[PDB]
Amino acid sequence: TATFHRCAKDPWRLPGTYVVVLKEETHLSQSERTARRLQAQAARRGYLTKILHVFHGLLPGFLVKMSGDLLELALKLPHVDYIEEDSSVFAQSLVEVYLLDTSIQSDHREIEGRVMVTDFENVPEEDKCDSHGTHLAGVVSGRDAGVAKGASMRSLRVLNCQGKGTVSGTLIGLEFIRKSQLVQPVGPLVVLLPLAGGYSRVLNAACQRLARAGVVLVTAAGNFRDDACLYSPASAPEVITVGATNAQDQPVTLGTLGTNFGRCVDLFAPGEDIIGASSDCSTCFVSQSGTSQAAAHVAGIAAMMLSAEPELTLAELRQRLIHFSAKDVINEAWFPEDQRVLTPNLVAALPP
């Protein structure tokens, strides 16, 4: 039977908006017919509904703004696999690196002519707009402070001026990537998701489909000093989930919090005191910290590894990242006792 899921982190919930996921082989025409049936049956009960978006490409389904009262009815619709209430996510050369983040300063000296701004924009209203993304674009491909200087980047805006996005917005962004690729294929794709929300079944499934479709995904483990498995896309298995370490080989402390850890973390990378492009001026640099910065280093290492070995499967690329990582340098004593064995003591490194 069809199931209902809502974010366990109650303040991150976005009630009134639902991702209705249909069974794996549901056609687009069927997804539209199921949306219309929901609108029609909902209308009979005096409820007004809006279909905001219809999914096709990775995951069939639709985004509906409606009253939660209609969920039992919606769960009985044929082709329905599960429904998820929307929730918030937050900022944490032959290869194309996609960035799903805030707006970016594309003319910054550091990334000028290496980053292409797509027309994609899906952000919630607000409760410096480009600080988070610009710095990250710079960490991946910046002329002076970048990891993969020769990498070209395509950016999508899924985070607003406060670094706040939605799971629905992120799904649409991930679908935009798959669509662009089918319309105009190129070489290997690296998808950088320097964001995180609570555990999400739909977001993990979208990441899993993109991964099984041959696209490489790199994500932030999260800055909640918690187990990365309770956050998304961090928890998605086939994704490369990156924790943050500092110059002293210490897991990063971010105030009362810090880097996430556990079995869902694939490896760690530098994520404290990271110099990179400051969106304050065209030649401005600033130091930043977070699993976003750590993930950006891994997206750069992976871009260079895939450029050297373009035939690497997602699994072969994973084995190369582990094999080339520095072993057992991280202070395990910073992690909770039971997590020390579960957390891989790996610090990302380029092949020598």
């Binding site: 002076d144 402070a145 990891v147 110059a247 990378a269 530098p270 005191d273 990271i274 110099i275 400051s278 304050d280 001026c281 030649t283 401005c284 640099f285 600033v286 130091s287 280093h297 290492i301 610090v347 990302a348 490194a349 380029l350 020598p352």
Partner: peptide, 24 residues
């Protein structure tokens, strides 16, 4: 501390992180 040029950051401090990942 926001620096208005690369040289200004270099004088203030070869970033540790690019060294750590073996890029240098």
């Amino acid at each position: 501390t926001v620096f208005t040029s690369w040289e200004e950051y270099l004088d203030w401090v070869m970033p540790w992180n690019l060294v750590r990942i073996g890029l240098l």
